[PDB]
Amino acid sequence: TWTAVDQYVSDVLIPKDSTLEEVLQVNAAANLPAHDVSPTQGKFLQLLVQIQGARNILEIGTLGGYSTIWLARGLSSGGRVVTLEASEKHADIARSNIERANLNDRVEVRTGLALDSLQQIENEKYEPFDFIFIDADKQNNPAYFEWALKLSRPGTVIIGDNVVRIRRFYELIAAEPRVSATALQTVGSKGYDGFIMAVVK
Amino acid sequence: TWTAVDQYVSDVLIPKDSTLEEVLQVNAAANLPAHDVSPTQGKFLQLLVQIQGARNILEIGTLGGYSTIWLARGLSSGGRVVTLEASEKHADIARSNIERANLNDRVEVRTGLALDSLQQIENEKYEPFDFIFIDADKQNNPAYFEWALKLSRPGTVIIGDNVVREGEVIIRRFYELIAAEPRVSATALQTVGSKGYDGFIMAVVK
């Protein structure tokens, strides 16, 4: 009944969003992998971006663009979100959802193998990112975290999704002196979303 | 066995700290009101203070000073933490714990009924606080939240603990209160603790 309770809290704290309502209706037909939907996590992402005052955001794992919207919603002056997704189809649906929320002018959806794109970004003039969101596979978490670090600077915030309800991924982080982190979770449609919150030293 | 898994995670991610170690040993004899201990939440507080770059912090519900330590550790320059605790005894033990963490030069523990102190702070020059942590009793949350807002400014971060979830199975009006408060935007999160999960709200003043 706690899930039920936090589910209700999410509903009252986070006001109905017609835009996000349809984005989810679209994803319902986009055949996305298999993930959880969490308004409270999205909200967390937007507020955190605002607290930090992030201007250059990197997201690994665009999916349907749901989290992309929440992140872009937090952007400051003339900020930007660069989001990566391998699937040509899913990225296309994501671009449409992002346009629907009228944020396509501050979001760049890069299609292709994440690792290739990460290398291309490192080979380009992209300044280090101030905020990075990782919502990927799992066999990929270790790699994406190391790459997030690679494209960061002191003070960069890294949020990484883990599992919807492992030890080695945290041991990895715990074994990474360049970062200081903690772990928490928030409720979602299909259970709680666990994630790490880290700051680069 | 998710609680077990998350407590293990808390153990690897957060480095054992001898200072906080003894602070807890001291509190073990302080006869403090029933509460949970969460290194992951403490870390969250320190990191968030650092991300925001908070310099003027207010804490409501000092207890033994455990959370006060994590917050003060997040300050940088000549920042300050003003923390309130009603119990003279518990506040004395808290200032001692803060002292052994060598953060007494950055923390002010105000003893007395929280409501009186909140009014005193308003009638004084502390002006607006950049970050506020509420860790108090029930029936008091609604009041402390409104007072937190009262002593805030646009951009102020407010973290408020609600309930400990030491079980799957087994509040509503409080979050409704927040939802009914246009001056803030908020979300709800949880982190594992010694005796269950700590539920809390994270809000930013508009």
Residue B195 CA to residue B36 CA, distance in Å, equals 6
Closest CB to A184: pick one of B44, B155, B172: B44
Domains for chain A: give ranges and CATH numbers: 1-201 (3.40.50.150)
3-state secondary structure chain B: CHHHHHHHHHHHHCCCCHHHHHHHHHHCCCCCCCCCCCHHHHHHHHHHHHHHCCCEEEEECCCCCHHHHHHHCCCCCCCEEEEEECCHHHHHHHHHHHHHCCCCCCEEEEECCHHHHHHHHHCCCCCCCCEEEECCCCCCHHHHHHHHHHCCCCCCEEEEEEEEECCCCCCHHHHHHHHCCCCEEEEEEEEEECCEEEEEEEEEEC
Q: Find out whether B178 and B186 touch, Cβ atoms under 8 Å.
A: yes
Are B168 and A2 inside 8 Å of each other by CB?
A: yes
| Residues of chain A with a CB closer than 8 angstroms to some CB in chain B | 1-2, 5-6, 8-10, 12-15, 40-41, 43-44, 47-48, 50-52, 157, 165-167, 170-171, 173-174, 180-187, 192, 194, 196-197, 199
Structure tokens, B55: 């310099």
Phi, psi of A164 (to 5 degrees): -95, 120
The minimum CA-CA distance between B133 and chain A, rounded to whole Å, is: 16
Judged by DSSP in three states, A25 sits in helix
Closest CB to B187: pick one of A5, A14, A194: A14
Residue B105 CA to residue B122 CA, distance in Å, equals 23
Residue B61 CA to residue B67 CA, distance in Å, equals 9
Does residue B72 have a known ligand-binding role?
no
Q: Find out whether A68 and A131 touch, Cβ atoms under 8 Å.
A: no
Cα–Cα–Cα angle for A191, A192, A197, rounded to 5 degrees: 155
State the greatest distance between any 2 C-alpha atoms of chain A, in Å, as a whole number. 50
Conformation bin of residue A53: beta by default, left when phi > 0, alpha when psi is -120 to 50:
left
Radius of gyration of chain A (CA): 16
Residue B100 CA to residue B72 CA, distance in Å, equals 13
Judged by DSSP in three states, A13 sits in helix
Experimental approach was X-ray
Residue B81 CA to residue B75 CA, distance in Å, equals 9
Tally the residues of chain B: 206
Q: Tell me the one-letter amino acid at A60.
A: I
3-state secondary structure A75-96: CCCCCEEEEEECCHHHHHHHHH
**CA-CA distances (angstroms) from residue B139 to B145, B171, B174?**
11, 10, 9
